[PDB]
Design a protein around this nucleic acid. Structure first.
Ligand SMILES: [Cl-]
Ligand SMILES: [Mg+2]
Ligand code: NA
Ligand code: NA
Length: 326
DNA sequence: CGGCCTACG
DNA sequence: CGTAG
DNA sequence: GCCG
């Protein structure tokens, strides 16, 4: 009664197993910091299964037959049900390695590989990194300067204000172009740590060259604190009462023929999209990305006019964005 | 055992 | 290497 | 870590 891929079941934003899923996600995150992508995936998938259940897990028996629950994930749940805490999870949380890898990987421009090297060199705090700016890229410098602001989530009201400024710039860059809110806010989140916009134009081809024109206009308005094409990873000035704060904004352009695929990809969740691409290839023999859906036997691309089309192509029941919170 | 999403900057 | 979801 |  629980399908094995996250894209085969609705997953709402809020659910009935929050504590259990959060603990499994700690172990997933820690597996990522050690470079164990397989373990990360399993713990992420197990957490997601609990998010999709219709009521709380209260007894170990209720895990029987659920996909992605084996000896390890079941033991974690069992300990939480019996004692309210899982010793393995708590040991991770307190560990110097987990806490430092988490802090460093939060920096825009720092991934697991860079964080781990710094950890191995003995660095532990943000002020440690500031004292040696010779080891920092310009991107990492911006990420470190703006880290505090970027650590606080923004509200949907902020997002709506940002969308108006983006729409103004896009309208001058290319009249008729449109701006769509994607990412977690499209899935229903009321607050989140970045904001994502997808830009297209109804006349195929007109969007060529658009992103540089948009960026120049936003820069000219004084709104761009940092930027580096079709994807732009920016830090924007967001107005706040009497002041402002830095916010991470991603801008993406797609031709209208690809828009459904780009909308689907950029709406997430990350696990949902990895699972959907895995399902596509392994179960359907079709190759999915944010540009299209390829049949490698006929050597053809599916045309889609909507996300609904893509779900139909793949033989999946349609899930609205609010149900893609895997 | 092999596999684990698939791109762009 | 980083980024995205 | 789990699935097929
Ligand atoms: Cl692994
Ligand atoms: Mg986002
Ligand atoms: Na980072
Ligand atoms: Na983003």
């Amino acid at each position: 009664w629980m399908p094995a891929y996250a894209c085969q079941r609705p997953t709402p934003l809020t659910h009935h197993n929050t504590g259990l899923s959060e603990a499994l996600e700690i172990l997933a995150e820690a597996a990522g910091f050690e470079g164990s992508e397989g373990r990360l995936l399993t713990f992420c998938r197990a957490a997601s299964v609990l998010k999709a259940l219709p009521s709380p897990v209260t007894t170990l028996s209720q895990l029987q037959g659920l996909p992605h629950f084996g000896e390890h994930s079941s033991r974690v749940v069992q300990e939480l049900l019996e004692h309210g805490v899982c010793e393995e999870v708590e040991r991770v949380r307190r560990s110097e390695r987990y806490q430092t890898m988490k802090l460093f990987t939060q920096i825009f421009g720092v991934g697991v590989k860079t964080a781990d090297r710094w950890y191995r060199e003995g660095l532990r705090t943000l002020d440690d990194l500031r004292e040696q700016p010779q080891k920092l890229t310009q991107q990492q410098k911006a990420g470190l300067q703006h880290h505090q602001d970027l650590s606080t989530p923004v509200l949907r009201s902020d997002v709506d204000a940002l969308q108006q400024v983006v729409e103004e710039a896009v309208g001058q860059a290319l009249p008729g172009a449109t701006v769509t809110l994607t990412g977690g806010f499209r899935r229903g989140k009321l607050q989140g740590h970045d904001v994502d916009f997808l830009i297209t134009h109804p006349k195929e081809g007109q969007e060529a060259g658009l992103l540089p024109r948009v960026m120049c206009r936003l820069q000219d308005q004084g709104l761009i604190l940092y930027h580096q094409f079709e994807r732009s990873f920016c830090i924007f000035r967001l107005p706040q009462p009497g002041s402002w704060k830095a916010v991470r904004v991603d801008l993406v352009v797609a031709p209208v023929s690809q828009f459904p695929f780009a909308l689907l990809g950029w709406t997430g969740s990350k696990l949902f999209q990895r699972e959907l691409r895995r399902f596509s290839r392994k179960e359907k023999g079709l190759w999915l990305n944010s540009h299209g859906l390829f049949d490698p036997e006929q050597k053809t691309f599916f045309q889609a006019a909507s996300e609904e089309d893509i779900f139909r192509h793949l033989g999946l029941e349609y899930l609205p964005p609010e149900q893609r919170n895997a």
